[PDB]
Each structure stands twice: as C-alpha cells, then as structure tokens.
Design an enzyme around this catalytic site. Sequence first.
Site, PDB file in Angstrom:
ATOM      1  N   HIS A 186       0.835  -1.200   0.000  1.00  0.00           N
ATOM      2  CA  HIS A 186       0.000   0.000   0.000  1.00  0.00           C
ATOM      3  C   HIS A 186       0.869   1.249   0.000  1.00  0.00           C
ATOM      4  O   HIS A 186       0.698   2.139   0.835  1.00  0.00           O
ATOM      5  CB  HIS A 186      -0.941   0.011   1.206  1.00  0.00           C
ATOM      6  CG  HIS A 186      -1.830  -1.189   1.289  1.00  0.00           C
ATOM      7  ND1 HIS A 186      -2.515  -1.531   2.436  1.00  0.00           N
ATOM      8  CD2 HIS A 186      -2.144  -2.132   0.368  1.00  0.00           C
ATOM      9  CE1 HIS A 186      -3.214  -2.630   2.217  1.00  0.00           C
ATOM     10  NE2 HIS A 186      -3.006  -3.016   0.971  1.00  0.00           N
ATOM     11  N   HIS A 212     -10.646 -11.233  -6.739  1.00  0.00           N
ATOM     12  CA  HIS A 212     -10.218  -9.922  -6.274  1.00  0.00           C
ATOM     13  C   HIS A 212      -9.254  -9.315  -7.287  1.00  0.00           C
ATOM     14  O   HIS A 212      -8.272  -9.952  -7.670  1.00  0.00           O
ATOM     15  CB  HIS A 212      -9.562 -10.055  -4.898  1.00  0.00           C
ATOM     16  CG  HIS A 212      -9.229  -8.751  -4.244  1.00  0.00           C
ATOM     17  ND1 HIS A 212     -10.060  -7.654  -4.298  1.00  0.00           N
ATOM     18  CD2 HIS A 212      -8.160  -8.378  -3.502  1.00  0.00           C
ATOM     19  CE1 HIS A 212      -9.513  -6.657  -3.626  1.00  0.00           C
ATOM     20  NE2 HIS A 212      -8.359  -7.070  -3.132  1.00  0.00           N
ATOM     21  N   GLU A 251      -7.277  -6.606  -7.126  1.00  0.00           N
ATOM     22  CA  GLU A 251      -6.178  -5.775  -6.654  1.00  0.00           C
ATOM     23  C   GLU A 251      -4.893  -6.247  -7.327  1.00  0.00           C
ATOM     24  O   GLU A 251      -4.740  -7.434  -7.619  1.00  0.00           O
ATOM     25  CB  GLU A 251      -6.059  -5.826  -5.128  1.00  0.00           C
ATOM     26  CG  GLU A 251      -5.134  -4.768  -4.539  1.00  0.00           C
ATOM     27  CD  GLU A 251      -5.300  -4.607  -3.039  1.00  0.00           C
ATOM     28  OE1 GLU A 251      -6.147  -5.306  -2.445  1.00  0.00           O
ATOM     29  OE2 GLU A 251      -4.574  -3.781  -2.448  1.00  0.00           O
ATOM     30  N   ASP A 274      -2.037  -7.108  -6.667  1.00  0.00           N
ATOM     31  CA  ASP A 274      -1.228  -8.203  -6.143  1.00  0.00           C
ATOM     32  C   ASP A 274      -1.837  -9.570  -6.449  1.00  0.00           C
ATOM     33  O   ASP A 274      -1.271 -10.600  -6.087  1.00  0.00           O
ATOM     34  CB  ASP A 274      -1.032  -8.047  -4.632  1.00  0.00           C
ATOM     35  CG  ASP A 274      -2.344  -8.012  -3.875  1.00  0.00           C
ATOM     36  OD1 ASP A 274      -3.336  -7.499  -4.433  1.00  0.00           O
ATOM     37  OD2 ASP A 274      -2.383  -8.500  -2.725  1.00  0.00           O
ATOM     38  N   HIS A 296     -12.055  -7.115   1.280  1.00  0.00           N
ATOM     39  CA  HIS A 296     -12.078  -5.736   1.766  1.00  0.00           C
ATOM     40  C   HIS A 296     -12.452  -4.749   0.661  1.00  0.00           C
ATOM     41  O   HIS A 296     -12.448  -3.537   0.872  1.00  0.00           O
ATOM     42  CB  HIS A 296     -10.719  -5.361   2.363  1.00  0.00           C
ATOM     43  CG  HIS A 296      -9.593  -5.414   1.379  1.00  0.00           C
ATOM     44  ND1 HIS A 296      -9.183  -4.313   0.659  1.00  0.00           N
ATOM     45  CD2 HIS A 296      -8.799  -6.438   0.987  1.00  0.00           C
ATOM     46  CE1 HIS A 296      -8.179  -4.655  -0.131  1.00  0.00           C
ATOM     47  NE2 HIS A 296      -7.927  -5.939   0.049  1.00  0.00           N
ATOM     48  N   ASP A 313      -8.016 -12.814  -0.040  1.00  0.00           N
ATOM     49  CA  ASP A 313      -7.399 -12.035   1.038  1.00  0.00           C
ATOM     50  C   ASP A 313      -7.832 -12.480   2.433  1.00  0.00           C
ATOM     51  O   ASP A 313      -7.041 -12.439   3.376  1.00  0.00           O
ATOM     52  CB  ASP A 313      -7.712 -10.543   0.870  1.00  0.00           C
ATOM     53  CG  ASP A 313      -6.750  -9.846  -0.071  1.00  0.00           C
ATOM     54  OD1 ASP A 313      -5.697 -10.432  -0.397  1.00  0.00           O
ATOM     55  OD2 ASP A 313      -7.042  -8.703  -0.477  1.00  0.00           O
ATOM     56  N   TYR A 325      -2.314  -8.464  10.031  1.00  0.00           N
ATOM     57  CA  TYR A 325      -3.047  -8.294   8.783  1.00  0.00           C
ATOM     58  C   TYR A 325      -4.466  -7.789   9.029  1.00  0.00           C
ATOM     59  O   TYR A 325      -4.916  -6.852   8.375  1.00  0.00           O
ATOM     60  CB  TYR A 325      -3.082  -9.611   8.005  1.00  0.00           C
ATOM     61  CG  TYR A 325      -3.702  -9.497   6.631  1.00  0.00           C
ATOM     62  CD1 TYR A 325      -5.048  -9.780   6.429  1.00  0.00           C
ATOM     63  CD2 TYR A 325      -2.941  -9.115   5.536  1.00  0.00           C
ATOM     64  CE1 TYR A 325      -5.618  -9.679   5.174  1.00  0.00           C
ATOM     65  CE2 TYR A 325      -3.502  -9.012   4.277  1.00  0.00           C
ATOM     66  CZ  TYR A 325      -4.839  -9.295   4.102  1.00  0.00           C
ATOM     67  OH  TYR A 325      -5.400  -9.193   2.850  1.00  0.00           O
ATOM     68  N   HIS A 352      -2.745 -15.126   0.279  1.00  0.00           N
ATOM     69  CA  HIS A 352      -1.517 -14.710   0.952  1.00  0.00           C
ATOM     70  C   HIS A 352      -1.114 -15.689   2.048  1.00  0.00           C
ATOM     71  O   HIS A 352      -1.892 -15.966   2.962  1.00  0.00           O
ATOM     72  CB  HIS A 352      -1.676 -13.314   1.561  1.00  0.00           C
ATOM     73  CG  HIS A 352      -1.775 -12.214   0.550  1.00  0.00           C
ATOM     74  ND1 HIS A 352      -0.758 -11.918  -0.331  1.00  0.00           N
ATOM     75  CD2 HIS A 352      -2.763 -11.323   0.297  1.00  0.00           C
ATOM     76  CE1 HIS A 352      -1.118 -10.900  -1.091  1.00  0.00           C
ATOM     77  NE2 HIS A 352      -2.331 -10.520  -0.730  1.00  0.00           N
TER      78      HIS A 352
HETATM   79  C1  LIG Z   1      -6.324  -0.540   1.577  1.00  0.00           C
HETATM   80  C2  LIG Z   1      -7.122   0.175   0.526  1.00  0.00           C
HETATM   81  C3  LIG Z   1      -8.205   0.962   0.896  1.00  0.00           C
HETATM   82  C4  LIG Z   1      -8.948   1.627  -0.074  1.00  0.00           C
HETATM   83  N1  LIG Z   1     -10.020   2.408   0.302  1.00  0.00           N
HETATM   84  C5  LIG Z   1     -10.761   3.070  -0.654  1.00  0.00           C
HETATM   85  C6  LIG Z   1     -11.843   3.857  -0.277  1.00  0.00           C
HETATM   86  O1  LIG Z   1     -12.149   3.969   0.911  1.00  0.00           O
HETATM   87  N2  LIG Z   1     -12.581   4.516  -1.237  1.00  0.00           N
HETATM   88  C7  LIG Z   1     -12.245   4.395  -2.570  1.00  0.00           C
HETATM   89  O2  LIG Z   1     -12.907   4.987  -3.421  1.00  0.00           O
HETATM   90  N3  LIG Z   1     -11.172   3.614  -2.948  1.00  0.00           N
HETATM   91  C8  LIG Z   1     -10.426   2.949  -1.996  1.00  0.00           C
HETATM   92  N4  LIG Z   1      -9.350   2.173  -2.377  1.00  0.00           N
HETATM   93  C9  LIG Z   1      -9.005   2.049  -3.834  1.00  0.00           C
HETATM   94  C10 LIG Z   1      -7.928   3.042  -4.271  1.00  0.00           C
HETATM   95  O3  LIG Z   1      -8.329   4.363  -3.973  1.00  0.00           O
HETATM   96  C11 LIG Z   1      -7.668   2.892  -5.769  1.00  0.00           C
HETATM   97  O4  LIG Z   1      -7.020   1.660  -6.000  1.00  0.00           O
HETATM   98  C12 LIG Z   1      -6.817   4.027  -6.334  1.00  0.00           C
HETATM   99  O5  LIG Z   1      -7.067   4.144  -7.717  1.00  0.00           O
HETATM  100  C13 LIG Z   1      -5.327   3.784  -6.123  1.00  0.00           C
HETATM  101  O6  LIG Z   1      -4.671   5.022  -5.969  1.00  0.00           O
HETATM  102  P1  LIG Z   1      -3.065   5.139  -6.025  1.00  0.00           P
HETATM  103  O7  LIG Z   1      -2.507   4.112  -6.980  1.00  0.00           O
HETATM  104  O8  LIG Z   1      -2.699   6.514  -6.530  1.00  0.00           O
HETATM  105  O9  LIG Z   1      -2.496   4.920  -4.645  1.00  0.00           O
HETATM  106  C14 LIG Z   1      -8.611   1.506  -1.417  1.00  0.00           C
HETATM  107  C15 LIG Z   1      -7.526   0.716  -1.783  1.00  0.00           C
HETATM  108  C16 LIG Z   1      -6.782   0.052  -0.816  1.00  0.00           C
HETATM  109  C17 LIG Z   1      -5.615  -0.797  -1.226  1.00  0.00           C
HETATM  110 FE   LIG Z   2      -6.717  -6.895  -1.332  1.00  0.00          FE
HETATM  111 FE   LIG Z   3      -3.885  -9.163  -1.423  1.00  0.00          FE
HETATM  112  O   LIG Z   4      -5.061  -7.820  -2.463  1.00  0.00           O
END
Ligand SMILES: Cc1cc2nc3c(=O)[nH]c(=O)nc-3n(C[C@H](O)[C@H](O)[C@H](O)COP(=O)(O)O)c2cc1C
Ligand SMILES: [Fe+3]
Ligand SMILES: [Fe+3]
Ligand SMILES: [O]
Lengths: 400, 400
Positions: free
Chosen positions: B22, B78, B80, B82, B146, B165, B193, B226
């Site tokens: 992150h 998911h 994300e 990763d 999440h 996750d 975690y 993970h």
């Molecule tokens: C731990 C975590 C929490 C996140 N919480 C939010 C959130 O509360 N609201 C939202 O719109 N996106 C949330 N996101 C998605 C990110 O805002 C999104 O992936 C963003 O495009 C990434 O920005 P960056 O690459 O500039 O850091 C979250 C992502 C992660 C990993």
């Molecule tokens: Fe995740």
């Molecule tokens: Fe993950």
């Molecule tokens: O993830």
Amino acid sequence: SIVVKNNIHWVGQRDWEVRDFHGTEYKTLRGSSYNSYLIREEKNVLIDTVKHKFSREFVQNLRNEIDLADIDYIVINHAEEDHAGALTELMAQIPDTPIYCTANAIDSINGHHHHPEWNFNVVKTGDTLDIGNGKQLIFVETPMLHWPDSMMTYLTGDAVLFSNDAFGQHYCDEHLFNDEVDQTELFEQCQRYYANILTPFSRLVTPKITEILGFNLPVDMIATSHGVVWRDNPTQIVELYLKWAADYQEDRITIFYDTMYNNTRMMADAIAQGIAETDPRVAVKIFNVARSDKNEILTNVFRSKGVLVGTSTMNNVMMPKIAGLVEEMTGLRFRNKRASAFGSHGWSGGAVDRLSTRLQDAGFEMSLSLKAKWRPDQDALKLCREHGREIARQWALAPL
Amino acid sequence: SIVVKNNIHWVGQRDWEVRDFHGTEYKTLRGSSYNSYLIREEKNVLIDTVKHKFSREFVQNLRNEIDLADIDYIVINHAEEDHAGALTELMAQIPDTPIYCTANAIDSINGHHHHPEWNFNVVKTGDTLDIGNGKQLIFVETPMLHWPDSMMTYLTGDAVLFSNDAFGQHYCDEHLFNDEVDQTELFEQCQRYYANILTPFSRLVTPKITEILGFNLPVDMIATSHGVVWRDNPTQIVELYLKWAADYQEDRITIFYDTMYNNTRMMADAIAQGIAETDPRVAVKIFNVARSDKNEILTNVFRSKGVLVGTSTMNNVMMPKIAGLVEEMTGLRFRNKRASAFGSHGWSGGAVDRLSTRLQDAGFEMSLSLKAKWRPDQDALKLCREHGREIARQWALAPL
Ligand SMILES: Cc1cc2nc3c(=O)[nH]c(=O)nc-3n(C[C@H](O)[C@H](O)[C@H](O)COP(=O)(O)O)c2cc1C
Ligand SMILES: [Fe+3]
Ligand SMILES: [Fe+3]
Ligand SMILES: [O]
Ligand SMILES: Cc1cc2nc3c(=O)[nH]c(=O)nc-3n(C[C@H](O)[C@H](O)[C@H](O)COP(=O)(O)O)c2cc1C
Ligand SMILES: [Fe+3]
Ligand SMILES: [Fe+3]
Ligand SMILES: [O]
C-alpha cells in the site's frame, strides 16, 4: 578556539554527524554548528553555549581558553537546548556568575534547567552593558523570532551583531567566515532554514529589522549561533530575509503526492506536462512524499506561487503522510499561495475533497479539484493534462 | 508447482524481499506470497494470478505446468494488483478465455487493465460452475471484504475454500501448509493483517461468516491468496476472525508519541509507571512514532482497551507524524476504545486540545488531557504519574 575579530573568540562546537533536528522534522543533510563566543576586554563575557550533547567538551575547551572564575557575565540570547544545553554543566562550576537575558528567558531557562536560584538579569531593548575599553553590549529584544525569549546582542566598537538563530543556517565547515565557504551550499542552507522555521513569523521580521536599522548601529560582522560568521558584505543575509519575509514566491509550482499503485503519480506527471506546455516561464518540481526529503518539499512550497497535492482514497480518508504534511503547512502559515487537490479513487472516494478543505484551512486559495477512477487511461490522462493547462492559465503572473 | 490436494496445484509466487505494501503504509517484515491455483479435472480452472512484478515468471511457470490453450476458465476473486496484476500478460496469450468474477470486478479489472473486450461472466452468491468428475465451483460474494469486488470460491468434493485475502497473511515460507511453519510468526502476521486492513469492516465480517456457515459446506482446506494453506484444523483462523471482529480488546494500554526534546517522552514514561502501580493486570506498551514500526503500533491499538497519545506544540499545531497516524486511525474506525491526549508546550500550547478533538473524531471515548510546560520537574512528574493512576482506575475492566 578561533579569533573572530580582535578580542572576540569562537568557542563553539562543530557537528558533522547531526542529521535530525526538532525530533526528526528537520533534516540537516550538511551537519551544523553551535556558535558560542568569548569576549575578552576589561570584562570577560560569554555569549550562549552549545548543545547539551557536547557539554563536557564545551567546558573543557573553555577552561583551555580562560579560567572559569575570570568569566564576568554570561549572555543567553536564546534558551533552546542547542544553545543553552550546556548551561547547567557550566553553572555547576561558577554558580555566582550573572546571567543576562530577557524576562521570557527566565521562564525558558528555568523550564529546562530547574535552577531558579541562578543570578538572572532581565534586559530589554536599549539596555547597555559596559565591558571596558570604550566598548559595551547593547541588547535588542526579538520576541517570537523564533521564540518568546529570543533577543540579539550588539557589541559597540567592534560592530558585531550576535543575532543567535537569526540569519544563521545549518552548515558545518572548518572555515568560520562566509567568504571562506561554498556560496551555493551556503545559500541553499540559508533558504532551507528560513522556509522551515521562520516562515510563520514573517510579519514580525520586517518591522523588527526596520527597528534595528533605525538604531543606526554599524555592522562589520554578524555572528549567528548556527553556521558561518558574516564578515564580507554581511548585510546580504539581511536583505535576503527582507525579500523572503514579503510573502516570497517565484514563478514556480510544486507538486507532491503519495500513492499505493502509482495511479495518482500518473496524474501528477500528466498535470506537469500540461503546465509546461502552457507556460514555459514556470518551473515545476515533483515529489513523492514517501520517497522524498520533507524539508526540501517545504522549501519548494515556500518558493512556489502555488502547489498541487495528490492523494488516493484509503478507508475514506487521505494518505497519512499527506495529512501529516498538510498539518505542518498549517503551522508554517504560507501566504499569497494557491492550491489544487487531486488523486485517484476506487469507488466512493472522498479523500480529495477532504484534502482540498484542509489545504484551504492551511491558508491556500483553492482552485478546482481533479479526480480519476483507478488507473487513468489515455482519455483520463488528457483530462489530467488539461487540468494542468487550466491551472497554468489561472495562476499566470503575466498574460499569455 | 506444489500439490495442494488431489488435482489442485499451487502456481503462485513467493516474495522474500517485499517490505512495502500500500505504498509504504504496510510493512511486510517477513515477506509475503501471492497464491494462485490451478485445478485440473475435466475442465481446467485457474484461480487468481500474481503481482504484476512477477508476470513473466508466472506465465512461464504456468506453461511448464499446462498448455495455456487447455485452460478453460479463469476466476478472479479480487482485482487488486497483487492478485490480478499478471492478467494482461496472460490474456495476451489466450484472449478468448472466459473470466468469472463479480459485477464490481468488471469495473475494477477494466479500471486497471483497460481491456473491456475480455469475456466476463458475472457471478453472484449461490451460482455454480461444473468442472467435471462430480465436482463444481460455488461462488460467494463478499463485498467490502475488503473491496466491493471481493468474493470467495468454494470447490465441492475436495472441500477447498478459496478465500483470497480473507484469513490470509503476509508470511513467506517454502512450506505451503499451516502445520509446517512457525506458529508464533504465523499468528503475529495474521493479527497484524486483520488489525491494519479489516478492522473498519468488522461489522461485515460476522454476518458474512455466519452466512457461509449457513451453507453447511464442508471445509477441508482454506486456500488464501496470501501465506499458508490452512489444512490442519483450518477453521481456527475463522474463529480468530470472529473474536477479532467483535470490537476486540485485551486488558492492554498503548502509549505512543512524538517529541523534539524528550519532554513528552518523560511524561509518557511517568504515566506508564502510574498505571502499572495501580493496575498490575494491564499490559503497557510505549512507542515513539518517529522511531517505531507504524503497523506494530496500530496492531497494539487494535489489541488495547485504550490509548494515550502524546505530542508537543509546534507552530500552534501537533507533530505531523501524530497527525498522520490519527488520520489513519480515523479510517480504521476502532470501536469501544478510550483515549487521553497529553504533551509538553512552551508558552500558549494548544496542540494537546487539538489532538484530543481529532482522537474524538476518530471514535475514541475521550478522558481528561494532561499538560506540562517545558521539561517536567519532580513535581510535574508526580502529576503525570497521578494521571496514569486516574486513567488506570477509570479504564478498569474490573473493580480494584
Ligand atoms: C487498503 C485500501 C483501501 C482503499 N479504500 C478506498 C476507499 O475507501 N474509497 C475508494 O474509493 N477507494 C479505496 N481504495 C481504492 C484506491 O483508492 C484505488 O485503488 C486508487 O485508484 C489507487 O490510488 P493510487 O494508486 O494513486 O495509490 C482503497 C484501496 C486500498 C488498497
Ligand atoms: Fe486486497
Ligand atoms: Fe492481497
Ligand atoms: O489484495
Ligand atoms: C520549532 C518549534 C516550535 C514551537 N512552537 C511552539 C508553539 O507554537 N507553542 C508552544 O507553546 N510551544 C512551542 N514550542 C516549544 C515546545 O513546545 C517546548 O519546547 C516543548 O516543551 C518541547 O516538547 P518535546 O520535548 O516533547 O518535543 C516550539 C518549539 C520549537 C522547537
Ligand atoms: Fe531556536
Ligand atoms: Fe538554534
Ligand atoms: O535554537
């Protein structure tokens, strides 16, 4: 010790290793020095001490220069630990020696050392202290520059202004005088010092300097508590302070951000391109707050006409390093600057609006925000690049 | 590759070097792993991928295991980076292969990869996918656990739950199963975690787990995305999640602060002594946020019944690292916890009251604050030590 001028001796301490000031909020990448001065006329006067860390060296070096019992007066311009830290160690050897300082200094000295039984002498602006041979010390109160207890001491005849923190900088060198060191490194450390420390007190800087100049006192040297002694055209640092205090800004825009997956980073780069192709006169700097020097960023903000701050949304709030930096800028109180918030989000977002509000609370004149979802595609990058164009046109110092 | 069970093969990637997740907000001190699974029945199914960094290794290793054209279905629990980072690299070789995921996942996959032409198959809770030999996949939606796009996949017969996750942890080891690794290190990474990631979604954890258990589906193994695969008493991690989701707290108090001249630090130590001599049942941890691991602090807060936060006043505001940490806690949304602000100041102060308000905004039930001027003397340290006594008595889980 080193001879500053005539009977003025430098009895301070160089610090080549120091990297952390104010906890870890001020990085001294080029070390620092803690300047203490011993004047030897009919009376012997010690001006300030050093950091407590070097207390044992300070006293020992002082013994080699003079018998401690022969010291008549001690002057404390400023009771911060980096200048009054070795005071307890010294007063343990000569507890009857009078201390000349401001009324606020009694509170700050006792607050650190817990020895109220010491012989304090309250001085105010205009008060004098004769040291013999037609010479005397003149005291000038400088409250909130940068502390309530701060003051300066002027020595007649030799025309040396002991300004303590003012006009000083964190720069360590074996040579004592300003004309003996690298000018670029010296200037950089000077501006870095003002930007991170004296910016919120800029409104007090100009009237105080004006007041001092009104005294019509000749200045041959300016002996600060940090870094070099100004002897060659010493008033150059005074003129810089006057320029820096007047809500200083260049045709420059600073962009900083934090990111988790580089989405916000890609937005920052696109904005920069839009600015540079709209206004070639503007200098642009980009920083990742998690990967950059915090004080370098703040120095750039101080130099900038405006900033753009980026953050992704994480748990409905902004990235912590951004929140921390915005909190600090709220204390530095930058003036006449503009700002724009941006960043990426996943679904509901909200961190950009949150950031925009806190930047406004920090005193920035806010422009429209820029938002993107996930990773910006070619169409989204155009919007980011267009945002930079709109910002450049709005923040233009001159037409076109 | 490694055989998980029968025809289930592990085709993921171990990451021994990784330290930053992150951005830099999650420190993985013991590395991590990105688990991908290949099921080979009548139909061949690939479940999730790996981080984009290891995309070239992932595809190459996958070729060595199976012909890419023989892969029938791809499941993305998911999206994300990763877990879905190597998707573009893979789909470049087999663009016609169907992708099974949630409706929200189409938004997140396309948001990262920009290939909407891919063949997506929207699934919802209860939907099935036959793979032959009397076995099938059952999909379960887990929104905001999440992410909005999150889901789990259950394999009948083999009774393996691919939870992505959930129930996973950042722990790297050559051995694949939970009974093959160090239990203490495993537990620590598991709780670390949940505390830093899943805490704000705790209200969704219990009803979702209850729903899954209502399906009456047998669980022989839990294959996360993970760390280790839970095969020996696999439901132990499920029970921990149930305990952790119920506003978890032990008889424990966490104290953290930032300081410039150790004045606030001396206050923190005095408070701790007062607590320990008032309530021996309470465990006390002390951290300097500038010198400590941020995620370790937050894990301790998660375990604590209450916290005390310290800061000095700097330019009328609080220390930035404290402001940043409070901002993050505002997002984690800790519940049923109490807090008390403290710290030292020079003249007017104000940062402690500022901090107390923001801690209240973070959801903490606030007790009275503790303030001191400059360096605390013996009398001032008594007051700090007394504050710890008052806190201990107020926050007592049981009488005496
Ligand atoms: C731990 C975590 C929490 C996140 N919480 C939010 C959130 O509360 N609201 C939202 O719109 N996106 C949330 N996101 C998605 C990110 O805002 C999104 O992936 C963003 O495009 C990434 O920005 P960056 O690459 O500039 O850091 C979250 C992502 C992660 C990993
Ligand atoms: Fe995740
Ligand atoms: Fe993950
Ligand atoms: O993830
Ligand atoms: C750069 C700087 C700014 C300060 N600003 C304030 C202030 O705005 N208000 C105040 O009461 N004290 C201020 N102080 C004084 C400190 O709060 C005081 O020295 C405190 O006792 C030190 O706390 P610590 O050692 O725990 O960091 C400031 C000190 C420094 C070095
Ligand atoms: Fe100072
Ligand atoms: Fe100083
Ligand atoms: O100082």
